[PDB]
């Protein structure tokens, strides 16, 4: 009632309206007016910016004036729209955000499967609006004006079941539809995406040949000399010794296959890891049987492992199961040429020009690939390693870009959950008007935040905001 409190709240609500409409209109201009930005995700973001700007301009003002002044001035039609639009707007924006999380989950988890096209995005947006308006419809249908003694009032006359069941059913249905369900769906999608991205995911500032000394030839000769071997084509395995997973058993079977051939004299093997005692005794058994095989079961520093990746000719990764194949990125960044099973992330990282791929679990195919690598070592291998280094670096810039965007969207959804929790708890409480003023300001402030999040956490949006201003 104090006029300053009223001027305070008038200034705050006007700040919400101007920041939300300016920022969201700027976002729609940024995505639509610039050709490169017309992606599927950005179309859904335009829908959310359209809904948030619309609800700000058409509802924040009247919610403030009618809340403080306790008098309806805008007629029956706008009483219905005032109680109707905000549900549909929240539905359109939050389910546009669900479309964004779903699109990233598709692009990351099943890249080969087709995402829907731009015009298909427009159809999905129209379906989003249909479901939004039809969910919001019952409330706008039951709003009405009561002309009365001192004032006109805008009230929702829910059907007169004495237990107030129909009203409570509608409110729980809306809250589930536009808060809990979308937050759970988006939470599963971005949790899957975030775990697989963080685990993907190599420190390129460390796994880098620049910290190695000398030519690769000098390093290979010094390394083999330290193991008691003389120069040869050098293969390395590093990983846990186990059965049915990291494939050291397939490599040992392949080593026994090569051991009877004359080409085996020209090969060197360095098997590194710890695990099954039988695989350890088998690898050690191969180590005493052949002078070109060396086994290291003790733990090594990562600086020494980087020394190995930069000295050996090839790294063998015969995994049965390899979700991420980070060891291949470590070898390729250091110029070792991978010979790996076509499983999991290894199939995604390695290409025809950047490694040698084989069927998982087939030792003869692996030995044949090792013989092919020996024949390839005859010719210069520098461009092959260059293609491997370029591939490992470019794959990491990808994963970094995806982690940056997905972190931004997580901030968007988090802002949504924070802004809407007090509101939904307030209206579902019945089943303190200063508290209503605060909760209403916080709930309707969410419309101004998305343009700020895009400007701060996304370089493309930052360039577009500096272009407009
Ligand atoms: C900003 O305003 C809104 C924002 C989101 C949803 C709904 C509204 C308006 N609806 C409120 C207002 C009074 C009538 N019902 C209420 C209600 C409360 C909770 C679920 C569903 C409805």
């Amino acid at each position: 009632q104090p006029a300053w409190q009223i001027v305070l709240w008038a200034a705050a609500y006007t700040v919400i309206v101007v920041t939300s409409v300016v920022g969201n209109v700027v976002v729609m201009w940024i995505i639509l007016a610039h050709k490169r930005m017309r992606t599927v995700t950005n179309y859904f973001l335009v829908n959310a910016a359209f809904a948030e700007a619309s609800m700000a301009a058409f509802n924040t003002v009247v919610n403030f004036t009618y809340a403080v002044h306790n008098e309806w001035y805008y007629g029956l039609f706008y009483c219905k729209f005032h109680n109707f639009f905000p549900i549909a707007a929240i539905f359109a924006s939050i389910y546009s955000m669900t479309a964004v999380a779903f699109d990233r989950y598709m692009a990351i988890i099943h890249p080969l499967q087709p995402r829907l096209s731009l015009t298909a995005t427009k159809v999905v947006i129209c379906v989003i609006w249909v479901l939004a308006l039809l969910l919001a419809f019952p409330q706008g249908y039951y709003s009405t004006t009561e002309t009365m003694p001192s004032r006109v009032v805008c009230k929702i006359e829910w059907p007169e079941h004495p237990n107030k069941i129909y009203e409570k059913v509608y409110h729980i249905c809306v809250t589930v539809l536009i808060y809990f369900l979308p937050l759970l769906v988006i939470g599963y999608l971005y949790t899957v995406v975030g775990i697989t991205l963080r685990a993907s995911g190599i420190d390129c500032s460390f796994w880098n040949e620049s910290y190695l000394t000398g030519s690769r030839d000098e390093r290979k000769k010094s390394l083999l000399s330290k193991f008691g071997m003389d120069e040869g084509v050098t293969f390395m395995f590093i990983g846990r010794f186990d059965r049915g997973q990291k494939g050291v058993d397939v490599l040992l079977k392949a080593i026994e296959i090569l051991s009877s051939k004359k080409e085996f004299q020209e090969m060197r093997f360095i098997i590194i890891g710890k695990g099954d005692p039988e695989l350890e005794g088998w690898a050690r058994s191969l180590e005493e049987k052949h002078g070109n095989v060396k086994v290291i079961t003790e733990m090594l520093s990562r600086e020494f492992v980087r020394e190995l990746y930069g000295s050996v000719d090839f790294v063998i990764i015969p995994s049965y199961f390899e979700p991420f194949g980070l060891v291949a990125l470590e070898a390729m960044c250091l110029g070792a040429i991978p010979i790996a099973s076509a499983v999991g992330g290894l199939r995604d990282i390695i290409t025809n020009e950047t490694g040698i791929l084989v069927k998982a679990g087939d030792p003869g195919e692996l030995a044949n690939a090792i013989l092919k690598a020996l024949e390839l070592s005859r010719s210069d291998l520098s461009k092959f390693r260059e293609n491997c280094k370029k591939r490992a670096m470019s794959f990491s810039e990808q994963v970094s870009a995806a982690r940056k965007v997905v972190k931004m969207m997580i901030v968007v959804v988090c802002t949504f959950a924070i802004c809407w929790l007090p509101f939904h708890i307030f209206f579902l409480l019945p089943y303190i008007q200063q508290v209503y003023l605060a909760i209403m300001w916080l709930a309707m402030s969410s419309t101004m935040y998305n343009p700020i999040i895009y400007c701060c956490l996304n370089d493309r949006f930052r360039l577009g905001f500096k272009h407009a201003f």
Side-chain angles (χ1 to χ4, degrees):
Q1 331 73 341
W4 46 278
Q5 291 193 41
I6 300 311
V7 185
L8 258 178
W9 290 103
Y13 277 73
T14 42
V15 162
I16 287 179
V17 186
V18 298
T19 310
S20 172
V21 174
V22 170
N24 277 305
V25 161
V26 169
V27 160
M28 292 182 289
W29 172 78
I30 280 174
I31 294 172
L32 300 159
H34 296 64
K35 296 178 176 180
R36 252 191 262 103
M37 295 288 280
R38 307 200 191 98
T39 71
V40 162
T41 275
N42 281 337
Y43 275 15
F44 287 114
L45 296 181
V46 153
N47 194 44
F50 169 77
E52 289 165 13
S54 314
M55 191 196 72
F58 298 163
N59 287 91
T60 309
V61 185
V62 186
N63 273 261
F64 175 68
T65 65
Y66 183 57
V68 165
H69 201 103
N70 289 347
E71 289 179 59
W72 190 255
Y73 293 136
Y74 320 95
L76 164 79
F77 173 82
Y78 196 77
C79 166
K80 294 184 176 296
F81 181 85
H82 157 254
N83 287 318
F84 167 73
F85 197 55
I87 287 168
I90 301 314
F91 189 94
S93 92
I94 193 54
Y95 280 89
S96 305
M97 300 303 180
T98 293
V100 162
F102 196 105
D103 185 76
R104 301 298 82 195
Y105 173 98
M106 283 293 297
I108 280 179
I109 297 303
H110 319 258
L112 213 53
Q113 295 187 15
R115 281 151 294 162
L116 53 91
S117 77
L118 262 62
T119 47
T121 64
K122 288 175 174 163
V123 168
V124 177
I125 291 175
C126 279
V127 167
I128 285 172
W129 271 110
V130 157
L131 299 144
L133 298 174
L134 297 197
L135 171 67
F137 182 82
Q139 178 154 296
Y141 184 81
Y142 289 134
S143 314
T144 181
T145 51
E146 304 170 359
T147 311
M148 184 176 282
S150 50
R151 52 172 172 249
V152 183
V153 298
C154 167
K155 192 189 173 174
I156 310 188
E157 273 301 320
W158 295 112
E160 308 283 354
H161 297 222
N163 38 18
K164 280 174 144 188
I165 282 304
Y166 181 88
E167 156 197 342
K168 279 322 168 201
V169 154
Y170 182 80
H171 285 201
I172 274 180
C173 258
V174 155
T175 276
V176 162
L177 267 185
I178 68 172
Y179 176 77
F180 286 107
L181 169 73
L183 288 184
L184 289 209
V185 173
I186 294 174
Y188 169 87
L189 289 180
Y190 282 152
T191 297
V192 168
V193 165
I195 279 182
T196 73
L197 277 192
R198 183 166 36 194
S200 287
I202 185 181
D203 183 13
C204 293
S205 78
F206 178 80
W207 303 99
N208 195 317
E209 200 180 341
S210 305
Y211 299 106
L212 299 182
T213 321
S215 85
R216 194 184 190 89
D217 279 25
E218 304 176 300
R219 295 198 301 270
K220 190 177 82 180
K221 175 189 171 186
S222 183
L223 167 71
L224 292 170
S225 159
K226 264 138 187 178
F227 292 145
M229 303 173 187
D230 53 335
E231 297 193 287
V233 191
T234 303
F235 306 87
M236 173 185 31
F237 168 88
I238 173 168
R240 186 183 56 195
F241 292 5
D242 56 31
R243 307 184 166 277
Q245 299 191 267
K246 282 324 163 205
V248 80
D249 44 342
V250 180
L251 172 60
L252 296 180
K253 298 156 182 170
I255 292 179
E256 297 196 331
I257 292 173
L258 298 165
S259 61
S260 56
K261 310 202 153 86
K262 64 176 180 293
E263 296 86 337
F264 186 74
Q265 295 173 315
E266 307 177 79
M267 307 168 178
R268 309 289 177 272
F269 292 80
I270 303 166
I271 304 103
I272 301 160
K274 52 184 70 168
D276 192 327
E278 296 188 12
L279 300 179
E280 293 192 19
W282 185 11
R284 289 283 175 196
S285 176
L286 282 182
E287 180 189 17
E288 67 182 344
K289 169 65 195 173
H290 308 104
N292 58 348
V293 174
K294 163 72 170 185
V295 179
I296 303 174
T297 53
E298 72 217 69
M299 178 142 287
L300 304 171
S301 71
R302 69 195 197 123
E303 290 81 9
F304 184 60
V305 168
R306 176 176 65 185
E307 203 69 38
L308 299 181
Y309 284 150
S311 309
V312 305
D313 297 295
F314 300 84
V315 170
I316 304 174
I317 314 171
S319 319
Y320 288 87
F321 168 70
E322 199 64 74
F324 302 108
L326 160 63
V327 43
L329 293 172
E330 297 175 344
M332 295 162 85
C333 285
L334 275 301
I337 299 157
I339 305 177
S341 311
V343 299
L346 300 169
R347 191 152 179 152
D348 293 328
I349 294 167
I350 303 168
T351 71
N352 198 8
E353 308 73 8
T354 57
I356 303 162
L357 295 168
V358 296
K359 186 184 315 167
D362 185 7
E365 254 212 60
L366 177 52
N368 284 338
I370 292 173
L371 289 161
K372 173 75 174 190
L374 170 63
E375 300 296 347
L376 292 168
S377 77
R378 306 294 177 81
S379 322
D380 176 57
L381 288 171
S382 297
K383 296 182 178 182
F384 208 162
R385 312 189 186 277
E386 185 185 26
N387 293 343
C388 292
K389 205 184 301 292
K390 263 155 81 176
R391 173 54 166 161
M393 288 168 9
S394 80
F395 182 98
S396 292
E397 284 145 348
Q398 297 178 26
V399 161
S400 173
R403 281 240 262 168
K404 291 177 280 191
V405 169
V406 166
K407 178 207 167 155
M408 179 181 78
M409 300 318 297
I410 290 162
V411 176
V412 165
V413 183
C414 264
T415 303
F416 181 93
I418 300 167
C419 285
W420 286 113
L421 176 73
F423 173 93
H424 284 290
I425 279 188
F426 176 92
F427 277 74
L428 294 197
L429 183 153
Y431 176 78
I432 73 163
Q433 202 197 239
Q434 330 89 311
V435 173
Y436 173 88
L437 278 164
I439 285 179
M440 198 53 52
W441 185 97
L442 175 61
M444 306 214 65
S445 68
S446 66
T447 47
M448 80 194 272
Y449 289 147
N450 289 345
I452 307 174
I453 297 169
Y454 306 156
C455 177
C456 187
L457 300 180
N458 200 270
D459 293 321
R460 312 220 159 209
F461 284 102
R462 157 105 68 173
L463 293 195
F465 275 95
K466 306 289 149 146
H467 189 325
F469 287 42

Coordinates of all heavy atoms in Angstrom, one line a residue, residues 82-128:
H82 N -6.6 -13.4 -20.1 CA -5.7 -13.2 -19.0 C -5.5 -14.5 -18.2 O -4.4 -14.7 -17.6 CB -6.1 -12.0 -18.2 CG -5.5 -12.1 -16.8 ND1 -6.3 -12.4 -15.7 CD2 -4.3 -11.8 -16.3 CE1 -5.5 -12.3 -14.6 NE2 -4.3 -12.0 -15.0
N83 N -6.6 -15.2 -18.0 CA -6.5 -16.5 -17.3 C -6.2 -17.7 -18.3 O -6.0 -18.8 -17.8 CB -7.7 -16.8 -16.5 CG -7.8 -15.9 -15.3 OD1 -6.8 -15.7 -14.6 ND2 -9.0 -15.4 -15.0
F84 N -6.1 -17.5 -19.6 CA -5.9 -18.5 -20.5 C -4.5 -18.6 -21.1 O -3.9 -19.7 -21.1 CB -7.0 -18.4 -21.7 CG -6.7 -19.3 -22.9 CD1 -6.9 -20.6 -22.8 CD2 -6.2 -18.7 -24.1 CE1 -6.6 -21.4 -23.9 CE2 -5.9 -19.5 -25.1 CZ -6.2 -20.9 -25.1
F85 N -4.0 -17.5 -21.6 CA -2.8 -17.5 -22.4 C -1.6 -18.1 -21.6 O -0.8 -18.9 -22.1 CB -2.5 -16.1 -22.9 CG -1.4 -16.0 -24.0 CD1 -1.6 -16.8 -25.1 CD2 -0.3 -15.2 -23.8 CE1 -0.6 -16.7 -26.1 CE2 0.6 -15.2 -24.8 CZ 0.5 -15.9 -26.0
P86 N -1.3 -17.7 -20.3 CA -0.1 -18.1 -19.7 C 0.2 -19.6 -19.6 O 1.3 -20.0 -19.7 CB -0.2 -17.5 -18.2 CG -1.1 -16.3 -18.4 CD -2.1 -16.7 -19.5
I87 N -0.9 -20.4 -19.4 CA -0.7 -21.8 -19.4 C -0.2 -22.3 -20.8 O 0.8 -23.0 -20.8 CB -2.0 -22.6 -19.1 CG1 -2.3 -22.4 -17.6 CG2 -1.9 -24.0 -19.4 CD1 -3.7 -22.8 -17.2
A88 N -0.8 -21.9 -21.9 CA -0.4 -22.3 -23.2 C 1.0 -21.8 -23.5 O 1.8 -22.5 -24.1 CB -1.3 -21.8 -24.2
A89 N 1.4 -20.6 -23.0 CA 2.7 -20.1 -23.2 C 3.8 -20.9 -22.5 O 4.8 -21.2 -23.1 CB 2.8 -18.6 -22.8
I90 N 3.5 -21.2 -21.2 CA 4.5 -22.0 -20.5 C 4.6 -23.4 -21.1 O 5.8 -23.9 -21.2 CB 4.1 -22.1 -19.0 CG1 4.0 -20.7 -18.4 CG2 5.0 -23.0 -18.3 CD1 5.2 -19.8 -18.7
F91 N 3.5 -23.9 -21.6 CA 3.6 -25.2 -22.3 C 4.4 -25.2 -23.6 O 5.3 -26.0 -23.8 CB 2.2 -25.7 -22.6 CG 2.1 -27.1 -23.1 CD1 1.8 -28.1 -22.2 CD2 2.2 -27.4 -24.4 CE1 1.7 -29.4 -22.6 CE2 2.1 -28.7 -24.8 CZ 1.9 -29.7 -23.9
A92 N 4.2 -24.1 -24.4 CA 4.9 -24.0 -25.6 C 6.4 -23.8 -25.4 O 7.3 -24.4 -26.1 CB 4.4 -22.9 -26.5
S93 N 6.8 -23.0 -24.4 CA 8.2 -22.8 -24.2 C 8.9 -24.0 -23.5 O 10.0 -24.4 -24.0 CB 8.5 -21.6 -23.3 OG 8.5 -21.9 -21.9
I94 N 8.3 -24.6 -22.5 CA 9.0 -25.7 -21.8 C 9.0 -26.9 -22.8 O 10.0 -27.7 -22.7 CB 8.3 -26.1 -20.5 CG1 9.2 -27.0 -19.7 CG2 6.9 -26.7 -20.7 CD1 10.6 -26.5 -19.5
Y95 N 8.0 -27.1 -23.6 CA 8.1 -28.3 -24.5 C 8.9 -28.0 -25.8 O 9.4 -28.9 -26.4 CB 6.7 -28.7 -24.9 CG 6.1 -29.6 -23.8 CD1 5.4 -29.0 -22.7 CD2 6.4 -30.9 -23.7 CE1 5.0 -29.8 -21.7 CE2 5.9 -31.7 -22.7 CZ 5.2 -31.1 -21.6 OH 4.7 -31.9 -20.6
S96 N 9.1 -26.7 -26.1 CA 10.2 -26.3 -27.0 C 11.6 -26.7 -26.4 O 12.4 -27.2 -27.2 CB 10.1 -24.9 -27.4 OG 8.8 -24.5 -27.9
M97 N 11.8 -26.4 -25.1 CA 13.0 -26.8 -24.5 C 13.1 -28.4 -24.5 O 14.3 -28.9 -24.6 CB 13.0 -26.3 -23.1 CG 13.0 -24.7 -23.0 SD 14.3 -24.0 -23.9 CE 13.9 -22.2 -23.6
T98 N 12.0 -29.1 -24.3 CA 12.1 -30.5 -24.4 C 12.5 -31.0 -25.8 O 13.2 -31.9 -25.9 CB 10.7 -31.1 -24.0 OG1 10.5 -30.9 -22.6 CG2 10.7 -32.6 -24.3
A99 N 12.0 -30.2 -26.8 CA 12.4 -30.5 -28.2 C 13.9 -30.3 -28.3 O 14.6 -31.1 -29.0 CB 11.6 -29.7 -29.2
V100 N 14.5 -29.3 -27.7 CA 15.9 -29.0 -27.8 C 16.7 -30.2 -27.1 O 17.7 -30.7 -27.7 CB 16.3 -27.7 -27.2 CG1 17.8 -27.6 -26.9 CG2 15.8 -26.6 -28.2
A101 N 16.3 -30.5 -25.9 CA 17.1 -31.6 -25.2 C 16.9 -32.9 -26.0 O 17.9 -33.7 -26.1 CB 16.6 -31.8 -23.8
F102 N 15.8 -33.2 -26.6 CA 15.6 -34.4 -27.3 C 16.5 -34.4 -28.6 O 17.0 -35.4 -29.0 CB 14.1 -34.5 -27.7 CG 13.7 -35.9 -28.2 CD1 13.0 -36.8 -27.4 CD2 14.1 -36.3 -29.5 CE1 12.7 -38.0 -27.8 CE2 13.7 -37.6 -29.9 CZ 13.0 -38.5 -29.1
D103 N 16.6 -33.2 -29.2 CA 17.4 -33.1 -30.4 C 18.9 -33.3 -30.1 O 19.5 -34.0 -30.9 CB 17.1 -31.8 -31.1 CG 17.8 -31.7 -32.5 OD1 17.3 -32.3 -33.4 OD2 18.9 -31.0 -32.6
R104 N 19.4 -32.8 -29.1 CA 20.8 -33.0 -28.7 C 21.0 -34.5 -28.3 O 22.0 -35.1 -28.6 CB 21.2 -32.1 -27.6 CG 21.1 -30.6 -27.9 CD 22.0 -30.2 -29.1 NE 21.4 -30.5 -30.4 CZ 22.1 -30.5 -31.5 NH1 23.5 -30.3 -31.5 NH2 21.5 -30.8 -32.7
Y105 N 20.0 -35.1 -27.6 CA 20.1 -36.5 -27.2 C 20.2 -37.4 -28.5 O 20.9 -38.4 -28.5 CB 19.0 -36.9 -26.3 CG 18.9 -38.4 -26.0 CD1 19.4 -38.9 -24.8 CD2 18.3 -39.3 -26.9 CE1 19.4 -40.2 -24.5 CE2 18.3 -40.6 -26.6 CZ 18.8 -41.1 -25.4 OH 18.7 -42.4 -25.1
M106 N 19.4 -37.0 -29.5 CA 19.4 -37.8 -30.7 C 20.8 -37.6 -31.5 O 21.3 -38.5 -32.0 CB 18.3 -37.4 -31.6 CG 16.9 -38.0 -31.2 SD 16.9 -39.7 -31.4 CE 17.1 -39.9 -33.2
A107 N 21.2 -36.3 -31.6 CA 22.5 -36.1 -32.3 C 23.7 -36.7 -31.6 O 24.7 -37.0 -32.3 CB 22.7 -34.5 -32.4
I108 N 23.6 -36.9 -30.3 CA 24.8 -37.5 -29.6 C 24.6 -39.0 -29.4 O 25.6 -39.8 -29.7 CB 24.9 -36.8 -28.2 CG1 25.6 -35.5 -28.4 CG2 25.7 -37.7 -27.2 CD1 25.8 -34.7 -27.1
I109 N 23.5 -39.5 -29.0 CA 23.4 -40.9 -28.6 C 23.2 -41.8 -29.8 O 23.8 -42.9 -29.8 CB 22.3 -41.1 -27.5 CG1 22.7 -40.3 -26.2 CG2 22.1 -42.6 -27.1 CD1 24.0 -40.6 -25.7
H110 N 22.4 -41.4 -30.7 CA 22.2 -42.2 -32.0 C 22.4 -41.3 -33.2 O 21.5 -40.9 -33.9 CB 20.8 -42.8 -32.1 CG 20.3 -43.4 -30.8 ND1 20.3 -44.7 -30.5 CD2 19.8 -42.8 -29.7 CE1 19.8 -45.0 -29.3 NE2 19.5 -43.8 -28.8
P111 N 23.7 -40.9 -33.4 CA 23.9 -40.0 -34.5 C 23.5 -40.4 -35.9 O 23.1 -39.6 -36.7 CB 25.5 -39.8 -34.5 CG 26.0 -41.0 -33.8 CD 24.9 -41.3 -32.8
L112 N 23.5 -41.8 -36.2 CA 23.1 -42.3 -37.5 C 21.6 -42.1 -37.7 O 21.2 -41.9 -38.9 CB 23.5 -43.7 -37.6 CG 23.9 -44.2 -39.0 CD1 25.0 -43.3 -39.6 CD2 24.4 -45.6 -39.0
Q113 N 20.8 -42.1 -36.7 CA 19.3 -42.0 -36.9 C 18.9 -40.6 -37.3 O 19.6 -39.6 -36.8 CB 18.6 -42.5 -35.6 CG 18.8 -43.9 -35.2 CD 18.0 -44.3 -34.0 OE1 17.0 -43.7 -33.7 NE2 18.3 -45.5 -33.5
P114 N 17.9 -40.5 -38.1 CA 17.6 -39.2 -38.7 C 16.8 -38.3 -37.7 O 15.7 -38.7 -37.2 CB 16.8 -39.5 -39.9 CG 16.1 -40.8 -39.6 CD 17.1 -41.5 -38.7
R115 N 17.2 -37.1 -37.5 CA 16.4 -36.1 -36.8 C 15.5 -35.4 -37.9 O 15.8 -35.4 -39.1 CB 17.3 -35.0 -36.2 CG 17.9 -35.4 -34.9 CD 19.2 -34.7 -34.6 NE 20.2 -35.1 -35.6 CZ 21.3 -34.5 -35.9 NH1 21.6 -33.4 -35.3 NH2 22.2 -35.0 -36.8
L116 N 14.4 -34.9 -37.4 CA 13.4 -34.3 -38.2 C 13.8 -33.0 -38.9 O 14.6 -32.3 -38.3 CB 12.0 -34.2 -37.5 CG 12.0 -33.4 -36.1 CD1 11.7 -31.9 -36.4 CD2 10.9 -33.9 -35.2
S117 N 13.3 -32.7 -40.0 CA 13.7 -31.6 -40.9 C 13.1 -30.3 -40.4 O 12.2 -30.3 -39.5 CB 13.3 -31.9 -42.3 OG 11.9 -31.6 -42.5
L118 N 13.5 -29.2 -41.0 CA 13.1 -27.9 -40.6 C 11.6 -27.7 -40.7 O 10.9 -27.3 -39.8 CB 13.8 -26.8 -41.4 CG 15.0 -26.1 -40.8 CD1 16.1 -27.1 -40.5 CD2 15.5 -25.0 -41.7
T119 N 11.0 -28.0 -41.9 CA 9.5 -27.9 -42.0 C 8.9 -28.9 -41.1 O 7.8 -28.6 -40.5 CB 9.1 -28.2 -43.4 OG1 9.8 -29.4 -43.9 CG2 9.5 -27.0 -44.3
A120 N 9.5 -30.1 -40.8 CA 9.0 -31.0 -39.8 C 9.1 -30.3 -38.4 O 8.2 -30.6 -37.6 CB 9.8 -32.3 -39.8
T121 N 10.1 -29.5 -38.1 CA 10.1 -28.7 -36.9 C 8.9 -27.8 -36.8 O 8.3 -27.6 -35.7 CB 11.4 -27.9 -36.7 OG1 11.4 -26.9 -37.7 CG2 12.6 -28.8 -36.8
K122 N 8.6 -27.2 -37.9 CA 7.4 -26.2 -37.9 C 6.1 -27.0 -37.6 O 5.3 -26.5 -36.9 CB 7.4 -25.5 -39.3 CG 8.5 -24.4 -39.4 CD 8.5 -23.8 -40.7 CE 9.5 -22.6 -40.8 NZ 9.9 -22.2 -42.1
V123 N 6.0 -28.2 -38.2 CA 4.8 -29.0 -37.8 C 4.8 -29.4 -36.4 O 3.7 -29.3 -35.7 CB 4.7 -30.3 -38.7 CG1 3.7 -31.2 -38.2 CG2 4.4 -29.9 -40.2
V124 N 5.9 -29.7 -35.8 CA 6.0 -30.1 -34.4 C 5.7 -28.9 -33.5 O 5.0 -29.0 -32.5 CB 7.4 -30.7 -34.0 CG1 7.5 -31.0 -32.6 CG2 7.6 -31.9 -34.8
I125 N 6.1 -27.7 -33.9 CA 5.7 -26.5 -33.2 C 4.2 -26.2 -33.2 O 3.6 -25.8 -32.2 CB 6.6 -25.3 -33.7 CG1 8.0 -25.5 -33.3 CG2 6.0 -24.0 -33.1 CD1 9.0 -24.4 -33.9
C126 N 3.6 -26.4 -34.4 CA 2.2 -26.2 -34.5 C 1.4 -27.2 -33.6 O 0.5 -26.9 -32.9 CB 1.7 -26.3 -35.9 SG 1.9 -24.8 -36.9
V127 N 1.9 -28.5 -33.5 CA 1.4 -29.4 -32.6 C 1.6 -29.0 -31.1 O 0.7 -29.2 -30.3 CB 2.0 -30.8 -32.9 CG1 1.6 -31.8 -31.8 CG2 1.4 -31.3 -34.2
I128 N 2.7 -28.4 -30.8 CA 3.0 -27.9 -29.5 C 2.0 -26.9 -29.1 O 1.4 -26.9 -28.0 CB 4.4 -27.4 -29.4 CG1 5.5 -28.5 -29.4 CG2 4.6 -26.5 -28.1 CD1 6.9 -27.9 -29.5

